[PDB]
Ligand binder design. Structure first.
Ligand SMILES: NS(=O)(=O)c1cc2c(cc1Cl)N[C@H]([C@H]1C[C@H]3C=C[C@@H]1C3)NS2(=O)=O
Ligand SMILES: NS(=O)(=O)c1cc2c(cc1Cl)N[C@H]([C@H]1C[C@H]3C=C[C@@H]1C3)NS2(=O)=O
Lengths: 49, 49, 49
């Protein structure tokens, strides 16, 4: 009871949670969600015209 | 969970109820039906369904 | 909180320590040093700064 509150006070829980959830961003959208590609227009876009 | 009609807590509950295991640092959820047989510290990580 | 250099709890926590109150249903944050003088239940509502 006195021990877990020390880890909550000193951010050790935050550090462990960061280590085991956020440092292992692996798959796709977390990494590549903030990048940019310009374009290249294909025919599948313009067909109803 | 407990057994019907015999109250036999199996699993990680009965390891602490029946004097088998000494402590359980594990993903265990504080309920109403678990405080009567074992005790919990202050919660260290929040979640939901 | 405690006073500087005297450890004299003013406010509401002193009302529980010095026998003047009985219980405190209140917006009260579970810290470390409040655990060593007065007992807390499980948390009912979670927040952050
Ligand atoms: N952001 S989190 O889920 O990983 C998380 C969740 C919790 C933490 C600490 C962290 Cl890092 N400590 C709190 C405790 C601190 C104090 C206040 C309630 C408890 C006492 N319990 S909690 O609310 O379960
Ligand atoms: N979403 S919230 O902050 O208002 C909130 C926060 C909490 C609630 C209920 C609510 Cl609605 N109950 C939990 C307790 C209920 C059970 C499960 C964990 C604890 C036991 N404490 S809590 O995590 O402090």
């Amino acid at each position: 009871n006195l021990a877990v509150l020390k880890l909550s006070e000193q951010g050790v829980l935050d550090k462990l949670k960061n280590k085991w959830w956020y440092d292992k961003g692996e798959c796709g959208a977390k990494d590549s969600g903030s990048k940019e590609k310009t374009s290249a227009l294909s025919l599948s876009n313009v067909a109803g015209v | 969970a407990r057994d019907a009609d015999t109250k036999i807590w199996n699993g990680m509950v009965g390891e602490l109820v029946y004097g088998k295991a000494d402590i359980a640092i594990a993903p265990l959820t504080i309920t109403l039906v678990r405080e009567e047989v074992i005790d919990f510290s202050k919660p260290f990580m929040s979640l939901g369904i």
